[PDB]
Amino acid sequence: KQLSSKFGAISSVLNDIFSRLDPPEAEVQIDRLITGRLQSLQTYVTQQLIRAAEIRASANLAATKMSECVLGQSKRVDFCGKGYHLMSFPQSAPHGVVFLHVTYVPAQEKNFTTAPAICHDGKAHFPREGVFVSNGTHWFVTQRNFYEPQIITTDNTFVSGNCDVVIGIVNNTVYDPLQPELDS
Amino acid sequence: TNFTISVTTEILPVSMTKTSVDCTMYICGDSTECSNLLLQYGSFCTQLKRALTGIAVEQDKNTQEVFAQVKQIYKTPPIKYFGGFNFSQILPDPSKPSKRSPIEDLLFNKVTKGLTVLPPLLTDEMIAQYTSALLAGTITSGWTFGAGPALQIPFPMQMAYRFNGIGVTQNVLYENQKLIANQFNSAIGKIQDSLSSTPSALGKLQDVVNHNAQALNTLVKQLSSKFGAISSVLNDIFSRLDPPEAEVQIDRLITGRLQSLQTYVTQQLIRAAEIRASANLAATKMSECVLGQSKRVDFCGKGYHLMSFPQSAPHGVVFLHVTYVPAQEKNFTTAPAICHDGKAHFPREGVFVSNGTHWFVTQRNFYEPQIITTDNTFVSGNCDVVIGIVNNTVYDPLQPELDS
Amino acid sequence: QGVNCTEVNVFQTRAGCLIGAEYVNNSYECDIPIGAGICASYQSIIAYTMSLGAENSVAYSNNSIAIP
Numbered sequence A: 001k002q003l004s005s006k007f008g009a010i011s012s013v014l015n016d017i018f019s020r021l022d023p024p025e026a027e028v029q030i031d032r033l034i035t036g037r038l039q040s041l042q043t044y045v046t047q048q049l050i051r052a053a054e055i056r057a058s059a060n061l062a063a064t065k066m067s068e069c070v071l072g073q074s075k076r077v078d079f080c081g082k083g084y085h086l087m088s089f090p091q092s093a094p095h096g097v098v099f100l101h102v103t104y105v106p107a108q109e110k111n112f113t114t115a116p117a118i119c120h121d122g123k124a125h126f127p128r129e130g131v132f133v134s135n136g137t138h139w140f141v142t143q144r145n146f147y148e149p150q151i152i153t154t155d156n157t158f159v160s161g162n163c164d165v166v167i168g169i170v171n172n173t174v175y176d177p178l179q180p181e182l183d184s
Numbered sequence B: 001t002n003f004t005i006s007v008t009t010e011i012l013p014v015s016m017t018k019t020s021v022d023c024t025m026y027i028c029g030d031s032t033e034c035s036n037l038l039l040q041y042g043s044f045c046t047q048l049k050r051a052l053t054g055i056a057v058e059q060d061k062n063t064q065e066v067f068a069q070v071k072q073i074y075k076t077p078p079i080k081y082f083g084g085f086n087f088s089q090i091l092p093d094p095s096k097p098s099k100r101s102p103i104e105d106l107l108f109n110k111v112t113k114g115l116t117v118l119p120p121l122l123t124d125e126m127i128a129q130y131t132s133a134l135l136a137g138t139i140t141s142g143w144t145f146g147a148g149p150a151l152q153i154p155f156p157m158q159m160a161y162r163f164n165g166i167g168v169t170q171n172v173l174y175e176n177q178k179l180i181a182n183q184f185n186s187a188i189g190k191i192q193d194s195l196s197s198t199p200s201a202l203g204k205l206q207d208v209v210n211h212n213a214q215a216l217n218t219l220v221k222q223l224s225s226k227f228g229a230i231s232s233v234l235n236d237i238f239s240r241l242d243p244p245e246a247e248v249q250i251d252r253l254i255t256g257r258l259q260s261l262q263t264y265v266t267q268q269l270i271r272a273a274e275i276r277a278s279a280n281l282a283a284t285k286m287s288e289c290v291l292g293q294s295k296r297v298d299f300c301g302k303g304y305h306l307m308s309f310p311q312s313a314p315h316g317v318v319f320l321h322v323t324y325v326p327a328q329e330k331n332f333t334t335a336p337a338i339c340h341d342g343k344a345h346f347p348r349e350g351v352f353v354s355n356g357t358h359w360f361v362t363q364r365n366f367y368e369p370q371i372i373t374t375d376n377t378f379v380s381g382n383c384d385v386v387i388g389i390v391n392n393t394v395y396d397p398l399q400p401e402l403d404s
Numbered sequence C: 001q002g003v004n005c006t007e008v009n010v011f012q013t014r015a016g017c018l019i020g021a022e023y024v025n026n027s028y029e030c031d032i033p034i035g036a037g038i039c040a041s042y043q044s045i046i047a048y049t050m051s052l053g054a055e056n057s058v059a060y061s062n063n064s065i066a067i068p
């Protein structure tokens, strides 16, 4: 639509200008018209360059996302999906790409009584990967994302020092799986 | 043999000042004939108005993306006890009417025609509320508030989990909890004093503000340019010369002003793209450093990253990265494997360590010797394949059980 | 925007003065931005401060944990 701009000339058409005004004097008007058209073209070119740079950055972001959480796992939280990420499915899109992220979302939480460690026989016991939880009268170790109570034993816990330097420790016995074999 | 809890600052710009420019008022002013002559130029003013509105909504979208990371506004408990840890400098102060933290107040104080400066969609009060909600979520609920429902977790076990995230057991944290809390408080005080005493720490935001103000001043001063004409005022050429020459002079002034405004628009678009990239980086850091722990090196500060604090800033965001820095190293003799009864023993998670006489196993990031047993070691092959194996016995905790 | 309507259902904001909208004390998730905290919507046309979200206060304690 910018082609039909006067740009300070008598008309947007140039053949009529050349017919009604002689090219010696119409050269200035034609030069003004073509330099206005060239300025509009340069503005369009600069806008296209800026848009192309932005879309290239977006495409690089999409390529990195497909490198991380499509061809493998992704440990970056809130990078390519809300919540814990499992996988994604790339599908074709018009002049673009779309992602179908499969995410892991926990639900239905419950209250439990926690403890930093367990003091048994004067020695503090720390979980290998879980956390000591209590439902009111018994102690259990559970995963950090799912509820799965288990008896505290020596296989999933390790001993490091005594149980007085730490703060918040409680008293609970630790079942030894090795004992009943040689008890009999 | 020792660690150091170091807190480092990271300032990243978020958004620039949204501006709107009127083409007719800036170029021609109050001249109707000038407006009639400009109306034949096409839709340059419409194009630039569309570009400026796109820039403004881009800034608003960047602010929404970097600040509204959650939909639930969390509140700190009235009992602000977290096992000896102090967070008074980052929590909002009820004494101040602005509900801003002393650190936030310090960062706010340290930062100082046809054109209208549009105010941002999000004010500083709701930005401060967003930062307070993020702090409450990352302190009381841990990192799980950004991945669904918020789960309550006390601070010592959250710090133990964060230490486990960089391969450090919780025993050293629970044996030196008071020392860790005192070091954290000292680091917070030191970084607050450094932010108060260093005017050059706010270089990026001040540079952005100065660039925007200087661009506005240059666009204002471009009206005084004669652009090769007799006068720089349209009134003088309208009331002092014949219309056949006054039309040419008016055309020269309007094309010079249009070129200047096009250059200003191009500079604004380039700066907006740079601010877009910076805001995307800041949003990534907020999603990784604040909403969780990142195993990436140097993404969330120097050294191993534990956690971070998001703080509001004028036209920017300030991060307080909590880092893990080892110190006080000691020379120790090592060996790839231990030979015992013709079997090669390899560590499960650590490395074999020797002080000269005995051999132990310890973690990679901390010194914690332990007796080399079969629980923390696994056997694989014999001893004539590995290179550098030494001779030592492997204790069996099962052996005294049936020895008696 | 940028001027006061006293020298032009009238409401005054920091961004400017708007006519044709009624101020509502309720906080809703807005759709049409205005500026300076105010964010109008259609229900008639109303203007109000935009809502950040539902207010929540987790019961924090030093001996309580939550496991899904």
Ligand SMILES: *[C@@H]1O[C@H](CO)[C@@H](O[C@@H]2O[C@H](CO)[C@@H](O)[C@H](O)[C@H]2NC(C)=O)[C@H](O)[C@H]1NC(C)=O
Pocket (backbone or CB within 6 Å): A135, A136, A137, A138, A149
């Ligand atoms: C906490 O959980 C444990 C195990 O799930 C409960 O122990 C069992 O409780 C059931 C009924 O509540 C009894 O029939 C079993 O005999 C119990 N097991 C043992 C080994 O005694 C315990 O009751 C739960 N406590 C609370 C307060 O809910």
Ligand SMILES: *[C@@H]1O[C@H](CO)[C@@H](O[C@@H]2O[C@H](CO)[C@@H](O)[C@H](O)[C@H]2NC(C)=O)[C@H](O)[C@H]1NC(C)=O
Pocket (backbone or CB within 6 Å): A170, A171
């Ligand atoms: C856990 O058990 C220890 C050892 O029995 C308790 O420590 C004793 O506590 C009593 C009074 O609480 C003192 O009179 C003893 O001198 C303590 N003995 C030792 C060796 O420290 C401890 O109180 C118990 N904790 C709980 C929560 O029951």
Ligand SMILES: *[C@@H]1O[C@H](CO)[C@@H](O[C@@H]2O[C@H](CO)[C@@H](O)[C@H](O)[C@H]2NC(C)=O)[C@H](O)[C@H]1NC(C)=O
Pocket (backbone or CB within 6 Å): B001, B002, B003, B179, B182, B183
């Ligand atoms: C690790 O370093 C910290 C500080 O760098 C040491 O803590 C100091 O301990 C001495 C003696 O106990 C005290 O006089 C200092 O006041 C402590 N400093 C601080 C800042 O609390 C700690 O002792 C070191 N660890 C070891 C094993 O030596």
Ligand SMILES: *[C@@H]1O[C@H](CO)[C@@H](O[C@@H]2O[C@H](CO)[C@@H](O)[C@H](O)[C@H]2NC(C)=O)[C@H](O)[C@H]1NC(C)=O
Pocket (backbone or CB within 6 Å): B086, B087, B088, B089
């Ligand atoms: C946490 O830090 C704040 C800020 O430094 C401490 O408040 C200071 O307390 C001392 C007395 O202990 C006063 O002399 C200072 O004037 C206080 N600072 C300010 C800014 O008012 C606070 O004591 C620290 N500890 C706790 C548990 O909050």
Ligand SMILES: *[C@@H]1O[C@H](CO)[C@@H](O[C@@H]2O[C@H](CO)[C@@H](O)[C@H](O)[C@H]2NC(C)=O)[C@H](O)[C@H]1NC(C)=O
Pocket (backbone or CB within 6 Å): B355, B356, B357, B358
């Ligand atoms: C290497 O560390 C071991 C473990 O601490 C040291 O063995 C102990 O050394 C002390 C200091 O003389 C003795 O009191 C203990 O009886 C030793 N323990 C055993 C089981 O013998 C050992 O001395 C250290 N070696 C060097 C060169 O520092």
Ligand SMILES: *[C@@H]1O[C@H](CO)[C@@H](O[C@@H]2O[C@H](CO)[C@@H](O)[C@H](O)[C@H]2NC(C)=O)[C@H](O)[C@H]1NC(C)=O
Pocket (backbone or CB within 6 Å): B390, B391
């Ligand atoms: C560690 O012990 C092994 C076994 O006792 C040593 O290997 C012996 O080395 C001698 C010569 O050095 C040979 O004659 C034997 O045949 C080897 N025995 C076996 C079973 O291979 C080894 O030298 C010892 N390492 C050190 C450093 O003393």
Ligand SMILES: *[C@@H]1O[C@H](CO)[C@@H](O)[C@H](O)[C@H]1NC(C)=O
Pocket (backbone or CB within 6 Å): A109, A110, A111, C059
């Ligand atoms: C846990 O208890 C607190 C207060 O006792 C309560 O606010 C919260 O809703 C409880 N959560 C669950 C899952 O029962």
Ligand SMILES: *[C@@H]1O[C@H](CO)[C@@H](O)[C@H](O)[C@H]1NC(C)=O
Pocket (backbone or CB within 6 Å): A167, A168, B079, B081, C062, C063
């Ligand atoms: C929890 O905090 C309260 C109040 O600060 C305190 O009385 C109690 O001893 C704390 N519990 C533990 C296990 O430290």
Ligand SMILES: *[C@@H]1O[C@H](CO)[C@@H](O)[C@H](O)[C@H]1NC(C)=O
Pocket (backbone or CB within 6 Å): B329, B330, B331
């Ligand atoms: C370890 O030994 C080397 C050379 O013997 C020495 O340069 C270095 O300082 C020592 N490291 C420590 C911590 O003493």
Ligand SMILES: *[C@@H]1O[C@H](CO)[C@@H](O)[C@H](O)[C@H]1NC(C)=O
Pocket (backbone or CB within 6 Å): B387, B388
């Ligand atoms: C260590 O290096 C020295 C010199 O390069 C060499 O003599 C020695 O055999 C090496 N030891 C091992 C275990 O590679």
Ligand SMILES: *[C@@H]1O[C@H](CO)[C@@H](O)[C@H](O)[C@H]1NC(C)=O
Pocket (backbone or CB within 6 Å): C002, C003, C004, C006, C007, C012, C013, C014
């Ligand atoms: C309202 O008008 C008065 C006087 O005309 C002016 O001083 C004041 O700044 C105006 N209010 C706003 C919010 O601009």
